[PDB]
């Protein structure tokens, strides 16, 4: 299954890739990568760069992607945020010269925006590009990641996606970011790399 990827955890410093990609899944998604926007950006990165030149990594562990946490102030649990910071730091520890790129979908965008905002200048500097599909803190944060440059940040906010409007509707819906994730986001990340 595409839905669990751990290439950074099992990564060793003698085989660094050009690209480390870290992704936070939406509420309900299985694994650490999910089954929508996660594997889509990951399939494209490998396609562009080679499978051997991209480490693909989901935010797992304490990040449970449960619906209740969307309502915490940062829009997710702080143990979700520390797990992402932990992985970002590991990519830096292991491979300080690779381009880190990252993604998030729905609740997972709040994991990125939460973790990324608190990082050492050195690490934020290695994170070349961040793609947020359905940014649940688009309204509140003003469509940027606080403390992290807008030039490396590309936000995808469909008109129909309630969560981009500063609240939260919770009910079964279609995935909105099919073409964004497959086309625009790889494209955007490819320009940043790196």
Swiss-Prot record:
SMART domains (alphabetical): Cutinase
Subcellular location: Secreted
GO process annotations (BP): carbohydrate catabolic process
Catalytic activity: cutin + H2O = cutin monomers
Single GO molecular function: cutinase activity
Disulphide-bonded residues: 16-95, 157-164
UniProt-annotated catalytic positions: 106, 161, 174
Name of the protein: Cutinase 1
């Amino acid at each position: 299954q595409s839905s669990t990827r751990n290439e950074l955890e099992t990564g060793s410093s003698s085989a660094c890739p050009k690209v480390i990609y870290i992704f936070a899944r939406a509420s309900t998604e299985p694994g650490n990568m999910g089954i929508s926007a996660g594997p889509i950006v990951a399939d494209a990165l490998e396609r562009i760069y080679g499978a051997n030149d991209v480490w693909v990594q989901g935010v797992g562990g304490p990040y449970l992607a449960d619906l209740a946490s969307n309502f915490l102030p940062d829009g997710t649990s702080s143990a979700a945020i520390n797990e992402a910071r932990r992985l970002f730091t590991l990519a830096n520890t292991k491979c300080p010269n690779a381009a880190i790129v990252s993604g998030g979908y729905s609740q997972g965008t709040a994991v990125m925006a939460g973790s990324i905002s608190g990082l050492s200048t050195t690490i934020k500097n290695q994170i070349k590009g961040v793609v947020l599909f359905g940014y649940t803190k688009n309204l509140q944060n003003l469509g940027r990641i606080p403390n992290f440059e807008t030039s490396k940040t590309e936000v995808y906010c469909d008109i129909a996606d309630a969560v981009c409007y500063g609240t939260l509707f919770i009910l079964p819906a279609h995935f909105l970011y099919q073409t964004d994730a497959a086309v625009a986001a790889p494209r955007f990340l490819q320009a940043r790399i790196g």
